[PDB]
Design a binder for this molecule. Structure first.
Ligand SMILES: CCCCCCCCCCCCCCCCCC(=O)OC[C@H](CO[C@@H]1O[C@H](CO[C@H]2O[C@H](CO)[C@H](O)[C@H](O)[C@H]2O)[C@H](O)[C@H](O)[C@H]1O)OC(=O)CCCCCCCCCCCCCCCCC
Ligand code: CLA
Ligand code: CLA
Ligand code: CLA
Ligand code: CLA
Ligand code: CLA
Ligand code: CLA
Ligand code: CLA
Ligand code: CLA
Ligand SMILES: CC1=C(C/C=C(\C)CCC[C@H](C)CCC[C@H](C)CCCC(C)C)C(=O)c2ccccc2C1=O
Ligand code: SF4
Ligand code: SF4
Lengths: 220, 80, 33, 340, 94, 143, 159, 74, 220
């Protein structure tokens, strides 16, 4: 541990620009780092996977927030074959006036981009109807992204580090991931479809404030 | 610095020593071959890693081997 | 207030300046400890 | 590499040139960078301004103007030469100099004055850029053939050798033959741009038909001045528009040119296999194939080997040049025969 | 060094390697006394690099953000906004 | 046994007009190299840095930037001419280290008193697999 | 007219009329960056004044607001912003290169070999004084050019 | 629809190349011959010449006859 | 036409598999380099001896296979797009008749469907496709830049860099500034990586611009 990169003495003593490039390129090759053991490899991998989850949740929450803030989801709901959905607004100080005129589309009051990811159709099929719902979804995903970082920080402290033999229990991991991660998630999504989206496809609005009273089926 | 190694299949022909452009190698007495000599690599801090020595060796497979390692001013051949 | 007019310059111009300054000063350190 | 010998045949000028090669090469490097910026970046700036809806900020005849005044001055001097500086001549050497006059044979224009503007200025400085870069590469090849700060004894390795090993950071393509190999690509670039400029300018401003009243109609109707100042203009108004004749030639007497167009694209793309890869992979593959031939008693005595490194580079550049040049050949011939 | 065609020395090794300042000069200050005194008074607070870096960065960011926020519509087309009715998309798309 | 000679700093230099290929600032801060030899007569030779020079009769001393240049010049002096040479490394503080020829005999001629370095007494085909040295810091080629 | 530098051919250059004529040596020795016996503050102030004065023209004449009644203000503001960026870069370079308390790395020998005191500019404190002077002088020089061009409105050539 | 089909096919291609990359890394870094003696993984290494040669034959056949048919039709 | 294009796709799959499998199974060694496993997964070469050994490591086999992957996926997506674009216009016979020869692909798919895209901006004005038009050219540029890293190799560039170092150390008013990491040319493996990256980015951006512009110009 002398200078950047702290994880490689061979690169850290290199006196050329090659120190910098290679330092970037070998950052995530944990097996090649100095004085690495087998246990630290698994623990660092666990923390990094939590990081990937946090980033994914942030990406989705950003999509929801920007669509709610600057999109035309409510307008698109009423005329889905002739209205173009809006991804996000444009604010470019390099633009000229003809471009400002040309990019104003979709019924908006300013230049916009049209979305081709298909998130409007997806979010309409699963029962979302207003901008308030989108805002609540974005906030919930923002909470999950923070939960991922907190868990990653917690499982990297001496009291809470799993041992090497924990990571090599194949039978237990297979049982938990087959039964719980795949099956139970499917059960929960089926429940969502029965309680929320299918009623929404018939004119019934079920939310967190009245879902207990309404019955998904008349005979229960 | 690079690493250079000599294996006991050497026949002591001396071609690798003659081929080196920075004087890394030299010949020393031995009793394992008919020529009564074998190569040696005592100055590997001056090796540039050109592999002319491997090009010169006649045995199959090679008797002198070069493994590239951490780079220095001497091993990158920088005059500035 | 027009939020894009304030936030686009901050993310496109000032934040890159601070981040690049910090990274340049980090990679030039003679010793880290 | 082979004949220079200062112990038996000394020359002072060659020695003096060899003794400031760093200064020569560094200054040529800098001027190449300067020309590249201030020539190609102008096209980039124009493309950006046009796409953003700001045509009044472009470099053009209707906007910020960059007129080639020296060329116009030389043209004016040459067009008015008959009478003062060359009293014995009736008319000028060429009709392109000026002096408004047109010669028509069989209802077709032969020659007439050629005007110069912002687009001509830009394309001429592009030509300067490509030529100076070609000179940089080839001169580096000749001047550092015998030695350099990296390989002190290069002259002992010869004119044509692949490398001197992965050490010193890596030494691929230090020989003079490799400098020639690299120079062929930039020569191709330069000459291709020259002939494209010629084709578009002559079709837009010179060639055409003339009516009984004397109304000249050009083949592409004078679109060079406004459209050749962006890259999108070269892509749309030159390649896409004029490729129609060659791609519609099937079923007529010009179908051979369509067939050659496709075949030359094929050869050009074929060369990339040789250019992008290396011989170790191919020798390893040949080992497996030779096993199968040995299985059935058909292994030849002349042992198969992959191409040498130099031969790989040579085959690559040869097929690249053949494919590109033949593609352009078919394009030109079909276009000019059908529309001319 | 420099005598009898000798350029090497184990004592004056700096001159052997050529550690010189070719254009460096050693001359007194040519500035006026009163001018120098004036310029040595109001340029004091900016001579501390640690504070200067933060001042430059934060003040520059603040100035840029404020100028962007307060820019006039007659100068920025993006600030002005559209002034023409929208054009229709294909197949009657809005 | 063999006593290496001492570097005399007053040795003259060859007759040269100069070039742009010589020493840079590294020689001032890190190190440089010096080659000396003796010529029977004044004559022309090709410089390893580009161009030609004229060596004097008697002692000659030349300063270079890298060891490879010294060895290349020495091989030219030994093959084309019948001249013996030596060279040294010089540090910024004025320390001199004698480099070549190390023990007075050329490396390609077997000489007694030399100690072997980096010799593995096996065939190259008997090196172990990488997994056998994982998480240890050793090398499969290190003995 | 071409000779080895200081009589030493084996250094990596050879003296020319360009690099050895007394006319060039006088001009280069009379520049603020080579006044080794002057405080870094004033040397930086002169540099900042000159460069800030020169930077006004391009922004005021070639920018996207050149055909508006407020082109001069836009040019002056662009010059000031560029000066700020350059001052930041100067401070970063100084921080990266020089450590507190380290001796000057400037050459201590002249052409004849006479020893000289090292330049204070190549230190942690001298470079900071030079940087502050550069920033102050740059702002002042930009303001002066704006005042002379678009306030008093002197009669120039193609302003 | 066009965007979704194209996007997911390119992502799939990159994933497929990565699979073989890390599979090759396995053979160098982790594979232990002594503890895999004569199992299926070792016999794969044992008949590599046959495997590679038959893959080469299939590629040659497909290329020759497909390119030939296209050129004949042209 | 479907028969012919499916056998082309099969060719792509078989050849890409050949390259990757040969890389994997020869990783530990071969007749040309019987001790390859000692040198690791990625290394430049083994020098010019024994006939020459350029591109002998497994990393290089991956590098070669990525080109064939891009080729194959290009064929797949070209076929999908042309068949659907003729379906959506009600002109299936166009595909059924033009697809049996390659000039049909060049003329009736590529050339014909670019006309709107390359008119996003022109000497007369611009429209909402201008960004896509710009992106189109951007792609062609990055692709081509990659060729530079793939065709010219390191020893040419290092010699050039030495001269620039000499020039900077000799220039007045600029030699008062010094570098702290010595500049050198890029490594052999690094250059292969940078070239392949420029190639892939250009590939993707060019096709995305063409696909989106061609479809949305006709249908929205
Ligand atoms: C936005 C840009 C963000 C990134 C910016 C910076 C990029 C810089 C890249 C520099 C690469 C340098 C290099 O040469 O780096 C070399 C490295 C690794 O080389 C290592 O080099 C090492 C060198 O040793 C040094 O390091 C060792 C390990 O620490 C030891 O410490 C040793 O002592 C020391 O000397 C060892 O030899 C290792 O064994 C060796 O693996 O290679 C690698 O990183 C190769 C593996 C990377 C992934 C390759 C596949 C992915 C790319 C395919 C195409 C993508 C297309 C994208 C399209 C997108 C479309 C929208
Ligand atoms: C029931 C208990 C349980 C559950 C729910 C989990 C859950 C998880 N574990 Mg596991 N784990 C458990 C027990 C459990 N574990 C036990 C007991 C052990 C010890 C033996 C471990 C040890 C362990 C380790 C060591 C690791 C995990 C990891 C993970 C995560 C994997 C990444 C992920 O999010 O995949 C999400 C996957 C799915 C949702 C299922 C796949 C769905 C496929 C793609 C099909 C989709 C079809 C669908 C229709 C598509 C809809 C698309 C949409 C856009 C409409 C995940 C959060 C990894 C991690 O990242 O940790 C942070 C990790 O490294 N676990
Ligand atoms: C990964 C998610 C993501 C992405 C890709 C974008 C992308 C964009 N945002 Mg958005 N944004 C996001 C999340 C995201 N945003 C979130 C979570 C918020 C808070 C609710 C905002 C709030 C926001 C505002 C207020 C503005 C933008 C704007 C923009 C645009 C210009 C960039 C900018 O100024 O950012 C600004 C970024 C921020 C103010 C903060 C982003 C969120 C941080 C990173 C949360 C970190 C949380 C984590 C736990 C730590 C661009 C389209 C501008 C726009 O629309 O211009 C036309 C704009 O004015 N964004
Ligand atoms: C389109 C492909 C392409 C491009 C762009 C280049 C570019 C270059 N080549 Mg290369 N080359 C290529 C293909 C290409 N080459 C191929 C295929 C080969 C193999 C045969 C080579 C072989 C080769 C050799 C052998 C040499 C070059 C040289 C050069 C340089 C010429 C100097 C110059 O013009 O500098 C000016 C720079 C440019 C024109 C690049 C474009 C800059 C744009 C227009 C402006 C950018 C603005 C701004 C900075 C953007 C910042 C954005 C921010 C977010 C970062 C330049 C860097 C020569 C060299 O080094 O000369 C000094 C040289 O010797 N090339
Ligand atoms: C750049 C200067 C320039 C050039 C290239 C020429 C070239 C020419 N001049 Mg001109 N000339 C010039 C300037 C020039 N002149 C000037 C300044 C004067 C003074 C007015 C003249 C006066 C002059 C005369 C009197 C004649 C020529 C003629 C000629 C021709 C001579 C051919 C030969 O073999 O000799 C040739 C076309 C001769 C001619 O007309 O040849 C057809 C001729 O008789 N020149
Ligand atoms: C998201 C990034 C971003 C942003 C927000 C801007 C913003 C701007 N650019 Mg663009 N630009 C960018 C990236 C960006 N650019 C990139 C990456 C490039 C290179 C490819 C360019 C290349 C470029 C050029 C070539 C030009 C612009 C110009 C402009 C201006 C056009 C609007 C106008 O009329 O200004 C009119 C306003 C003025 C003439 C005066 C502006 C004065 C500023 C606001 C003073 C700031 C002072 C402050 C201390 C700076 C602190 C910096 C730092 C320490 C935090 C505007 C300030 C134009 C311009 O005017 O530049 C000055 C121009 O000519 N840009
Ligand atoms: C893009 C290039 C550019 C442009 C458009 C301008 C434009 C301008 N310069 Mg500047 N200048 C430039 C580059 C440029 N300069 C450079 C590179 C230098 C250094 C050699 C200078 C040095 C300079 C000086 C010394 C002066 C100007 C002045 C001027 C103004 C009057 C010029 C005149 O009358 O003639 C004008 C606004 C004059 C000015 O502003 O006077 C108040 C003035 O005195 N310029
Ligand atoms: C779950 C996925 C996954 C994971 C966890 C890993 C993990 C690992 N891989 Mg593997 N890999 C994957 C997927 C994955 N890989 C895929 C999909 C491929 C096929 C492409 C590969 C191909 C691959 C190779 C070939 C290698 C690894 C290696 C590695 C190691 C990290 C190397 C590193 O630090 O790179 C650092 C990262 C970089 C230097 C960044 C590279 C970015 C590239 C060049 C493209 C960037 C372009 C950019 C986006 C341009 C934007 C432009 C803009 C205008 C849009 C590590 C063990 C290495 C290893 O283990 O060696 C022994 C190694 O050599 N992987
Ligand atoms: C358009 C370009 C192109 C073409 C046609 C090929 C063709 C081939 N490549 Mg190559 N390749 C290319 C580009 C190309 N590659 C690129 C860009 C790369 C990235 C670096 C590679 C990387 C690569 C690898 C790594 C491998 C291949 C392999 C193959 C073979 C696949 C099997 C096949 O189709 O056999 C059929 C053969 C052909 C279609 C070749 C053309 C046959 C002609 C038409 C026959 C008639 C010739 C004619 C009569 C001669 C007249 C000329 C003269 C006598 C006058 C084949 C020889 C693989 C291989 O070797 O498999 C065995 C292999 O391992 N290629
Ligand atoms: C494809 C390729 C090969 C392999 C290509 C080879 C070996 C060429 C083979 C040429 C012909 C087909 C050989 C057979 C010639 C016989 C005379 C044919 C007899 C039968 C006819 C009469 C029908 C390399 O060896 C190579 C080397 C270095 C860099 C790149 C590459 C490279 O890309
Ligand atoms: S690699 Fe080159 S320098 Fe190193 S020992 Fe071999 S021949 Fe000598
Ligand atoms: S990659 Fe090829 S050309 Fe480059 S050093 Fe290795 S063998 Fe020589």
């Amino acid at each position: 541990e002398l200078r950047f990169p702290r994880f490689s003495q061979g690169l850290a003593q290199d006196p050329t620009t090659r120190r910098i490039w290679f330092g970037i390129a070998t950052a995530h090759d944990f097996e090649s780092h100095d004085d690495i053991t087998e246990e630290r490899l698994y623990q660092n991998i666990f923390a990094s996977h939590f990081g990937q989850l946090a980033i994914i949740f942030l990406w989705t929450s950003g999509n929801l927030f920007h669509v709610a803030w600057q999109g035309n989801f409510e307008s698109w709901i009423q005329d889905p074959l002739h209205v173009r959905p809006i991804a996000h607004a444009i604010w470019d100080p390099h633009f000229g006036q003809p471009a400002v005129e040309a990019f104003t589309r979709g019924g908006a009051a300013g230049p916009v981009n049209i979305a081709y990811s298909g998130v409007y159709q997806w979010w309409y099929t699963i029962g979302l109807r207003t901008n308030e719902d989108l805002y609540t979804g974005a906030l919930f995903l923002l909470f999950l992204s923070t939960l991922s970082l907190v868990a990653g920080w917690l499982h990297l402290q001496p009291k809470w580090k799993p041992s090497l033999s924990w990571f090599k229990n194949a039978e237990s991991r297979l049982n938990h991931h087959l039964s719980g991660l795949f099956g139970v998630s499917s059960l929960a999504w089926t429940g969502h479809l029965v309680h929320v989206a299918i009623p929404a496809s018939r004119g019934e609005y079920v939310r967190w404030n009245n879902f207990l009273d309404v019955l998904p089926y008349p005979q229960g | 610095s690079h690493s250079v190694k000599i294996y006991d299949t050497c026949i002591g022909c001396t071609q690798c020593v003659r081929a080196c452009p920075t004087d890394v190698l030299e010949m020393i007495p031995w009793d394992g071959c008919k020529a009564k000599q074998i190569a040696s690599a005592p100055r590997t801090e001056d090796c540039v890693g050109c592999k002319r020595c491997e090009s010169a060796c006649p045995t199959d497979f090679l008797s002198v081997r070069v493994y590239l390692g951490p780079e220095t001013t001497r091993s990158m051949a920088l005059s500035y | 207030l027009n939020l894009p007019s304030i936030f686009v310059p901050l993310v496109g111009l000032v934040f890159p300046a601070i981040a690049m300054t910090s990274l340049f000063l980090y990679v030039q350190k003679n010793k880290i400890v | 590499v082979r004949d220079y010998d200062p112990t038996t045949r000394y020359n002072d000028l060659l020695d003096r040139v060899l003794r400031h090669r760093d200064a020569i090469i560094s200054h040529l490097n800098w001027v190449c960078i300067f020309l590249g910026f201030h020539s190609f970046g102008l096209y980039i700036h124009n493309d950006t301004m046009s796409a953003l809806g700001r045509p009044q900020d472009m470099f053009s005849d209707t906007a910020i103007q960059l007129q080639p005044i020296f060329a116009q001055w030389v043209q004016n001097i040459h067009a008015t030469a008959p009478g003062v500086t060359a009293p014995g001549a009736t008319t000028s050497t060429s009709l392109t100099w000026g002096g408004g006059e047109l010669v028509a044979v069989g209802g077709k224009v032969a020659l007439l004055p050629i005007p110069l503007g912002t687009a001509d200025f830009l394309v001429h400085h592009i030509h300067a850029f490509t030529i100076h870069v070609t000179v940089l590469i080839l001169l580096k090849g000749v001047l550092f053939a015998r030695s350099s700060r990296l390989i002190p004894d290069k002259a002992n390795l010869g004119f044509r050798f692949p490398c001197d090993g992965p050490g010193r950071g890596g030494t691929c393509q230090v020989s003079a033959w490799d400098h020639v190999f690299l120079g062929l690509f930039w020569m191709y670039n330069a000459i291709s741009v020259v002939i494209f400029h010629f084709s578009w300018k002559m079709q837009s401003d010179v060639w055409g038909t003339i009516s009984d009243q004397g109304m000249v109609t050009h083949i592409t109707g004078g679109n060079f001045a406004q459209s050749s100042i962006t890259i999108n203009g070269w892509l749309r108004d030159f390649l896409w528009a004029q490729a129609s004749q060659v791609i519609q030639s099937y079923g007529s007497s010009l179908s051979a040119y369509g067939l050659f167009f496709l075949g030359a694209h094929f050869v050009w793309a074929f060369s990339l296999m040789f250019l992008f890869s290396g011989r170790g992979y191919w020798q390893e593959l040949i080992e497996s194939i030779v096993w199968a031939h040995n299985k059935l008693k058909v292994a030849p005595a002349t042992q198969p080997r992959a191409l040498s490194i130099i031969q790989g580079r040579a085959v690559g550049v040869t097929h690249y040049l053949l494919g590109g040049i033949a593609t352009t050949w078919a394009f030109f011939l079909a276009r000019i025969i059908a529309v001319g | 060094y420099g005598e009898k065609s000798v350029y090497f020395d184990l004592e004056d090794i700096g001159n052997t390697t050529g550690q010189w300042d070719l254009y460096g000069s050693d001359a007194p200050s040519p500035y006026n006394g009163l001018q120098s005194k004036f310029f040595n008074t109001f340029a004091a607070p900016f001579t501390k690099r640690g504070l200067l870096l933060k001042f430059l960065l934060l003040g520059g960011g603040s100035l840029l953000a404020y100028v962007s926020a307060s820019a006039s519509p007659d100068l920025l087309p993006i600030k002005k906004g559209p002034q023409l009715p929208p054009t229709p998309g294909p197949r009657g798309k809005i | 046994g063999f006593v290496p000679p001492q570097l005399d700093p007053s040795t003259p230099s060859p007759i040269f007009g100069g070039s742009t290929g010589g020493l840079l600032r590294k020689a001032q801060v890190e190190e440089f190299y010096v080659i000396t030899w003796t010529s029977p007569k004044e004559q022309v030779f090709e410089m390893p840095t580009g161009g030609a020079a004229i060596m004097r009769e008697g002692p000659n001393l030349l300063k270079l930037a890298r060891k490879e240049q010294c060895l290349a010049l020495g091989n030219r002096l030994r093959s084309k001419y019948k001249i013996a040479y030596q060279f040294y490394r010089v540090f910024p503080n004025g320390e001199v280290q004698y480099l070549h020829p190390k023990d007075g005999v050329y490396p390609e001629k077997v000489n007694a008193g030399r100690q072997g370095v980096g010799q593995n007494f096996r065939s190259i085909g008997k090196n172990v697999s990488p997994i056998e040295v994982k998480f240890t810091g050793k090398n499969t080629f290190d003995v | 007219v071409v000779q080895p530098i200081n009589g030493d051919p084996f250094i990596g250059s050879l003296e020319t009329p360009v690099t050895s004529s007394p006319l060039v040596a006088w001009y280069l020795s009379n520049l603020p960056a080579y006044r080794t016996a002057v405080s870094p503050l004033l040397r930086g102030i002169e540099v900042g004044l000159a460069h800030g004065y020169l930077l006004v023209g391009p922004f005021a004449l070639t920018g996207p607001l050149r055909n508006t009644p407020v082109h001069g203000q836009a040019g002056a503001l662009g010059a000031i912003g560029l000066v700020t960026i350059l001052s930041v870069v100067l401070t970063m370079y100084g921080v990266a290169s020089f450590e507190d308390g380290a001796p000057s790395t400037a050459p201590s020998l002249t052409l004849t070999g006479r020893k000289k005191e090292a330049d204070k500019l190549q230190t942690a404190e001298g470079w900071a004084q030079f940087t502050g002077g550069f920033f102050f002088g740059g702002v002042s020089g930009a303001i002066w050019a704006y005042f002379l061009l678009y306030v008093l409105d002197l009669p120039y050539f193609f302003k | 629809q066009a965007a979704l089909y194209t996007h997911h096919q390119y992502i799939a291609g990159f994933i497929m190349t990565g699979a073989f990359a890390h599979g090759a890394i396995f053979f160098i870094r982790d594979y232990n011959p002594e503890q895999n003696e004569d199992n299926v993984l070792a016999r794969m290494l044992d008949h590599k010449e046959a495997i590679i040669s038959h893959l080469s034959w299939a590629s040659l056949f497909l290329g020759f006859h497909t390119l030939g048919l296209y050129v004949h039709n042209d | 036409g479907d028969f012919l294009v499916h056998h082309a796709i099969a060719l792509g799959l078989h050849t890409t598999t050949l390259i990757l499998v040969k890389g994997a199974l020869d990783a530990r060694g071969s007749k040309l380099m019987p001790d390859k496993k000692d040198f690791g997964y990625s290394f430049p070469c083994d020098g010019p001896g024994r006939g020459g050994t350029c591109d002998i490591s497994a990393w290089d086999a991956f590098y070669l296979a990525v080109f064939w992957m891009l080729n194959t996926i290009g064929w797949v997506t070209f076929y999908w797009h042309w068949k659907h674009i003729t379906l959506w216009q009600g002109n299936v016979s166009q595909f059924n008749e033009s697809s049996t020869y390659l000039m049909g692909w060049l003329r009736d798919y590529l050339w014909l469907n670019s006309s709107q895209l390359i008119n996003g901006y022109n000497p007369f004005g611009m429209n909402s496709l201008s960004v896509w038009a710009w992106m189109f050219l951007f792609g062609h540029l990055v692709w081509a830049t990659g060729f530079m890293f793939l065709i010219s190799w390191r020893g040419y560039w290092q010699e050039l860099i030495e001269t620039l170092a000499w020039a900077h150390e000799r220039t007045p008013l600029a030699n008062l500034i010094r570098w702290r990491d010595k500049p050198v040319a890029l490594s052999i493996v690094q250059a292969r990586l940078v070239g392949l990256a420029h190639f892939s980015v250009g590939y993707i951006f060019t096709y995305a611009a063409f696909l989106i512009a061609s479809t949305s110009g006709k249908f929205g």
